[model samples]
Target: SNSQLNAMAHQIQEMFPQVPYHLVLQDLQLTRSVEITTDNILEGRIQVPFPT
Candidate 1:
């Protein structure tokens, strides 16, 4: 998922603007589904490991 990382993160961020950088990256790696990961963020099922 190396090269896939950038585009996936881009699409997800467009939908959920406030999602932390690595947060999106991390969960995308977790599930690899753009739909569910976005849902996960929207539903508060996932959280940033460390926030600014």
Candidate 2:
């Protein structure tokens, strides 16, 4: 895994501690855009275990 996105993952983790690591990395891998990925996470578009 590339630490580039891994870095984003860390920041994302800080902002959204409730979100699961696997889910964060999973979305990050697809978009690679922290902004949108976090947005999606924040909005519950993607998150822990799957759905809310």
Candidate 3:
């Protein structure tokens, strides 16, 4: 999810052509996978908090 958030990072990184993926799998309450549970791990990308 942090990778998604990194997409919003407007800073430019000269060292790399693209930003590296370093997102943490925390804060499920605000992610599209909020409804995900142990019973359902096969569900693909569920929902992402839309940007305003």
Candidate 4:
């Protein structure tokens, strides 16, 4: 499971090359996130909180 999570994190970093990646881990608690923007409007990103 640990190796799988790290691989997934690397994939995410590849997708969002402009954003820096921080690798952290949690137990039992997991959440999936998605962000959407439209009309070229920029709001902000909800930073991922890790190391739980």
Clashes of 1: 0
Query: Which window of 10 residues has the lowest lDDT sum in candidate 2?
Result: 43-52
lDDT of 4 by residue, 17-48 (tens): 44334422221014232223111112323244
| TM-score ranking of the models | 2, 1, 4, 3
RMSD of each: 2.4, 3.0, 11.3, 8.0
Sorted by lDDT, highest first, which candidate order results? 2, 1, 4, 3
Give the local distance difference test score of model 1.
0.78
Could you give candidate 1's per-residue lDDT for residues 1-52 as a string of tens digits? 3669767988988877777766888788888888888888878867755565
lDDT of 3 by residue, 1-52 (tens): 4565444322222222232222212323235242342112223322233346
Q: Model 2 segments beyond 4 Å from truth?
A: 50-52
Most TM-score-accurate candidate: 2
Question: Comparing candidate 1 with candidate 4, which one achieves the higher lDDT?
Answer: 1
lDDT of 2 by residue, 1-52 (tens): 5788888888888988888876788788888988989898878878477465
TM-score of 1: 0.73
Error of 4 at 22 (Å): 2.4
Compute each candidate's TM-score over C-alphas: 0.73, 0.76, 0.17, 0.39
The segments of candidate 3 whose C-alpha lies over 4 angstroms from its true place after superposition are 11-52
Where's the lowest-lDDT run of ten residues in candidate 4? 33-42
Evaluate residue 19 in candidate 3 and report its C-alpha lDDT on the 0 to 100 scale.
29
